[PDB]
Design a protein around this nucleic acid. Sequence first.
RNA 1: AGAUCUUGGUGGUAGUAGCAAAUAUUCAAACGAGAACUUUGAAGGCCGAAGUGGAGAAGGGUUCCAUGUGAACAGCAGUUGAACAUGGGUCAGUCGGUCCUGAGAGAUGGGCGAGCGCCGUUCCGAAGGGACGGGCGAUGGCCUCCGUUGCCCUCGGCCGAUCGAAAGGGAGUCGGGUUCAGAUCCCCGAAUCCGGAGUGGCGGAGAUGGGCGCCGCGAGGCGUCCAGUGCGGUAACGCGACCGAUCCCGGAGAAGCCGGCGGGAGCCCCGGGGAGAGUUCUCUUUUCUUUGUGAAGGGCAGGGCGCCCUGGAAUGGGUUCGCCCCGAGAGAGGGGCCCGUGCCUUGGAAAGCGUCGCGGUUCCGGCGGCGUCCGGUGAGCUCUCGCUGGCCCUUGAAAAUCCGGGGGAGAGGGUGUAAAUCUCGCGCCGGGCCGUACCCAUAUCCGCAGCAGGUCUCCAAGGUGAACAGCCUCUGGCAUGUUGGAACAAUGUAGGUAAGGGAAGUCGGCAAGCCGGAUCCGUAACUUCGGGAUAAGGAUUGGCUCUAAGGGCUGGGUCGGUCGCGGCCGGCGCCUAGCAGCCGACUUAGAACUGGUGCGGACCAGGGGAAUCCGACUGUUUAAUUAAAACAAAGCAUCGCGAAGGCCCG
RNA 2: AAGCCAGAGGAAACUCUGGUGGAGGUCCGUAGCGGUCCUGACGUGCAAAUCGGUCGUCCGACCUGGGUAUAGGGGCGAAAG
Lengths: 114, 91, 50, 149, 69
Amino acid sequence: VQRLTYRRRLSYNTASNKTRLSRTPGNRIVYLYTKKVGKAPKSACGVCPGRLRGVRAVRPKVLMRLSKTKKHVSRAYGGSMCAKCVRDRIKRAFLIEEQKIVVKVLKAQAQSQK
Amino acid sequence: AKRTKKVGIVGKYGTRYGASLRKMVKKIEISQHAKYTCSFCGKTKMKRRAVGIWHCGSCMKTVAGGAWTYNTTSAVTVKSAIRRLKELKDQ
Amino acid sequence: SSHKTFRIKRFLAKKQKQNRPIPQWIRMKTGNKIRYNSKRRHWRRTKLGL
Amino acid sequence: PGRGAPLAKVVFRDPYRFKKRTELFIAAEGIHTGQFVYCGKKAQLNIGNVLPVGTMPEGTIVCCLEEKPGDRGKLARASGNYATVISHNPETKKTRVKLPSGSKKVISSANRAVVGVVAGGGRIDKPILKAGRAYHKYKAKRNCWPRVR
Amino acid sequence: PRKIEEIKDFLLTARRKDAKSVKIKKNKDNVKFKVRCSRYLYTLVITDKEKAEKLKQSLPPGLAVKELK
RNA sequence: AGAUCUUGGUGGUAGUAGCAAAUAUUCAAACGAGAACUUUGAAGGCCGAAGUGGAGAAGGGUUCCAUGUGAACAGCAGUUGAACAUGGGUCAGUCGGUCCUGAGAGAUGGGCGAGCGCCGUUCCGAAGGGACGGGCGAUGGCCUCCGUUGCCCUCGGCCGAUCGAAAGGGAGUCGGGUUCAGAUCCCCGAAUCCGGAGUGGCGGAGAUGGGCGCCGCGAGGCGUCCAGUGCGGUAACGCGACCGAUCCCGGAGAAGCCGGCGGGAGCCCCGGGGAGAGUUCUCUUUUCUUUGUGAAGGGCAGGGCGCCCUGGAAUGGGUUCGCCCCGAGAGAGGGGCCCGUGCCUUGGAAAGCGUCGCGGUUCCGGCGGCGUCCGGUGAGCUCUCGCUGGCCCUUGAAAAUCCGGGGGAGAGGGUGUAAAUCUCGCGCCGGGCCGUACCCAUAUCCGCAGCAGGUCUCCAAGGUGAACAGCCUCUGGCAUGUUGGAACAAUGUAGGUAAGGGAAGUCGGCAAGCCGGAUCCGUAACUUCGGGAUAAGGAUUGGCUCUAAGGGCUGGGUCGGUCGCGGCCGGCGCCUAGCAGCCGACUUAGAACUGGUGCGGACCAGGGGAAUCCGACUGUUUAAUUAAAACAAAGCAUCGCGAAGGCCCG
RNA sequence: AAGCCAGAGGAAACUCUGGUGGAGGUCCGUAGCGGUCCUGACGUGCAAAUCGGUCGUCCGACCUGGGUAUAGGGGCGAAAG
Ligand SMILES: [Mg+2]
Ligand SMILES: [Mg+2]
Ligand SMILES: [Mg+2]
Ligand SMILES: [Mg+2]
Ligand SMILES: [Mg+2]
Ligand SMILES: [Mg+2]
Ligand SMILES: [Mg+2]
Ligand SMILES: [Mg+2]
Ligand SMILES: [Mg+2]
Ligand SMILES: [Mg+2]
Ligand SMILES: [Mg+2]
Ligand SMILES: [Mg+2]
Ligand SMILES: [Mg+2]
Ligand SMILES: [Mg+2]
Ligand SMILES: [Mg+2]
Ligand SMILES: [Mg+2]
Ligand SMILES: [Mg+2]
Ligand SMILES: [Mg+2]
Ligand SMILES: [Mg+2]
Ligand SMILES: [Mg+2]
Ligand SMILES: [Mg+2]
Ligand SMILES: [Mg+2]
Ligand SMILES: [Mg+2]
Ligand SMILES: [Mg+2]
Ligand SMILES: [Mg+2]
Ligand SMILES: [Mg+2]
Ligand SMILES: [Mg+2]
Ligand SMILES: [Mg+2]
Ligand SMILES: [Mg+2]
Ligand SMILES: [Mg+2]
Ligand SMILES: [Mg+2]
Ligand SMILES: [Mg+2]
Ligand SMILES: [Mg+2]
Ligand SMILES: [Mg+2]
Ligand SMILES: [Mg+2]
Ligand SMILES: [Mg+2]
Ligand SMILES: [Mg+2]
Ligand SMILES: [Mg+2]
Ligand SMILES: [Mg+2]
Ligand SMILES: [Mg+2]
Ligand SMILES: [Mg+2]
Ligand SMILES: [Zn+2]
Ligand SMILES: [Zn+2]
């Protein structure tokens, strides 16, 4: 077997020194210094544990050169919140504002007396 | 089969620490690692995350509880007392 | 080491330049009284201060 | 870390500007995420509400009780502990409470406090059983543990 | 590199102002027209031998027609 | 003449002790005055991938590399050298520093201090010097008009300077060639990140349609009016852009240790096909070597999903090695997203490599031919990615930096080949400073030295085997560790063996010796019921020839009733106890045969039992005479303290 | 070790068997870390503390680099001055 060497001056197996084996067209195996693994956004609701869909999972500075579409989903709160916890918020905002109309009408017939 | 006659969960401690100390920690270790039934979703998935923190896997509901049991008998009588005082604050 | 500062490297540059034999024609000067460079420093015999 | 009592992150609405305020309370046992707490004089008796001891019934027990009227919580903060409101007197605006050590103390009626006992339960009941578990317990607090006589 | 699939888009890339040369490489099964632009090396692969000859005679003027044999 | 006097020099000892840790050298030749030691070749060995191999951090600082000398040094020698002398050598937007903060360090305000100063780091400060926005203006100037710029209004808490990591966070460079010595830096070729464009570089999007009056046979044209800050999918979400400020919300950065599985690769293994070697006393279609496709795009496998739609499940079902999941929506069907390091393709064969040649430019990135192939296995090893668990009175950073969303203050054109705008495609310019050689250790570092010591990491082949053990080998390396020759006395140091006895030796079984692996049996007292326990004790073990068992893939037809020697469906039949063929792992069990009873044949590899004292255990300790019964420890008990406080520094 | 699966015995109470699982300041034992004994070697040494064999521990109160903090009547000490 052909044993390998590091190609830089960092000689320790730290998190910023991860490598993968690559076979060059010169028929030799060399190390290739991989980038880190990115993560998709977490949902803004902070409840459900899955990460968002439709969004490219990269390091934060790779987002500076990514297209806008690759960084979000075409929906309200898309790319920041999950669909499931957005439907809950649409229902919650509507129903609670219905409740305020209920208590306003309830006091409206309660102020019919002086 | 029945693998241990009496030690139960504290067989991991071997012969160490003395029989009565292993017996004292046995009931606590049973409750500490137990999965309680969540009172918010009904799924038996409410398990201890840290000391005093109980978290449900299904509904993602975290509740502050006892160190080893999900809720301590002290805080149970406290909650009843506070409920009694609130309904007595009004008439 | 391989990683060195500019200040350190320049310091070693002066030490390297002045660790050399005396010129041959110096001994021919009148009133010389100098035989050889007595400030010669070998890397293994003695170490630099820094 | 270094504390047996869980903490509670509670988010309020700032009343003077468009912002959110993130407070770090001490969790009274029984509170949960997605639960509303109410802080003020007009809040009612519920586990987690923060209301002054002067506007409390004669026997309610509190969690993170102030020592001086106006500062933040200072008493009964360790896990499982609680003060107990004993009596008031509208004269001189004072309130007598029973501290966890059994000491009676007279404090202002404007001292706020959480309602309930602080979570973390009977942490002292479990024997540590191991010099290593004591080693890890005090590695989170301060360099005090191996005690030479 | 960018691979070009059809013919007419290879023409206007080859006639682009930043196009520097065209290299024609004949293999045992196809002919590759590689135009060297400022950013990419656009490669068009033709299996048909007669199509390659027509395209070569129709290459834009004022451009290198370097052959690789 | 003295002071174990001060300094310098010199003797006897004395050609003495010694030049003995890690198996090892030998033959021939060359250069040379000179060869045990240099160089080349042949041989025999060692390191044996946890190396005596290949590369780094710290440290050294020129030791690096050529040529020359043979004074001194390399404790023998030397034609050799890490010595001496003379020259030469370190090339970066994308490898680091540089930037961020961490534990912490440290000014200013303030306080103290005789004083140099030191306390303090948000505390007792009027701590924002900035901002697109609007206005008053000087029209600075290609005065149409947007860039200036003074002031005013509005907004603006990182609420604290600054320093702190060549292993933390941190955008983006790879393949080939090249030197005496440098290369991810040079050259060739493929890319890519950030920043900029004032007059704005080109396309594309925005965005270019309807209503009505008319002309015109219709098509197609003219005038008016009205929209037009994109579109698709039920959904998950998708498409190439997709106006938008202050402000707000969120994400990424940003997370422990351990276990078990799965995917991918690299290596290893097996069967063939080439090319070149090796053996051929006989045998061997044999044995050995070698048999590429970088980044970055596009496409497709594959892996994952706590994502969506239909539907409504108990005779509960699905499912894992383990778990686990389901009326809060299972199974099933159909989709969506993420990762894609795997394969194909552009790069790409033109290069590289292996072989066979032909020329020469003291010494050519010379030229040419042929090839660079097809397969199969796996609890294999090492990485990496993923899923799911366990443990914690332990919950396993921060900040730069970047992004998404909410909101809609505003901006833009009057239907023009349009406007504001664009995170879309392509194009143009730039990336400064410092480091970069070499050693990285039985000789380049510290230990006074070429010192058996010490000194932080990465890679990791075959056999045996449970194994990164020990033992042997390949790649790579070396010359036995600061000398050799001849002999084989005593005493030694290291290693063996020993008849009969078996601790009688000795303070004492000190030392040595016995035992030892695996399989099958069989295991006591006591016990905190976990243990003791490999208790104790016994049997077996080789080689060869077989026999069983433990799997995976495909195909199961009754037929032309017809024809797009084959099918659109069915007149046309009963694997339904399952068969057929193909392929492939180790493991276990059983038996026969056989050897001078030898077989864990080397290597690896527990002596055992009965008691007494002490300490519960695990852990720690007198670096350099004490590892213990000492310390610690969990457990138990006592004490002080409600903050104007307890304990403590100053 | 807990958890889980199947089976058996029981009139019940409940018990038993075989798997699976992989806990533990768990055992044997490498690298590492340490340093018991030979009171071995050495003792004008290789060494101003090293070497050989034999040993203790080897998932944790584990080993370790670097950055930091504590300074002399002071520090720091699982404690030996
Ligand atoms: Mg490849
Ligand atoms: Mg030195
Ligand atoms: Mg003590
Ligand atoms: Mg004298
Ligand atoms: Mg005298
Ligand atoms: Mg002698
Ligand atoms: Mg000798
Ligand atoms: Mg060997
Ligand atoms: Mg090396
Ligand atoms: Mg040299
Ligand atoms: Mg000599
Ligand atoms: Mg020199
Ligand atoms: Mg400010
Ligand atoms: Mg800095
Ligand atoms: Mg770093
Ligand atoms: Mg080099
Ligand atoms: Mg390829
Ligand atoms: Mg389903
Ligand atoms: Mg070729
Ligand atoms: Mg180098
Ligand atoms: Mg040494
Ligand atoms: Mg010194
Ligand atoms: Mg020898
Ligand atoms: Mg020798
Ligand atoms: Mg040596
Ligand atoms: Mg004998
Ligand atoms: Mg005998
Ligand atoms: Mg005797
Ligand atoms: Mg005697
Ligand atoms: Mg002995
Ligand atoms: Mg015994
Ligand atoms: Mg046999
Ligand atoms: Mg002890
Ligand atoms: Mg005890
Ligand atoms: Mg020690
Ligand atoms: Mg000692
Ligand atoms: Mg006791
Ligand atoms: Mg252990
Ligand atoms: Mg052990
Ligand atoms: Mg000792
Ligand atoms: Mg001795
Ligand atoms: Zn959500
Ligand atoms: Zn729940």
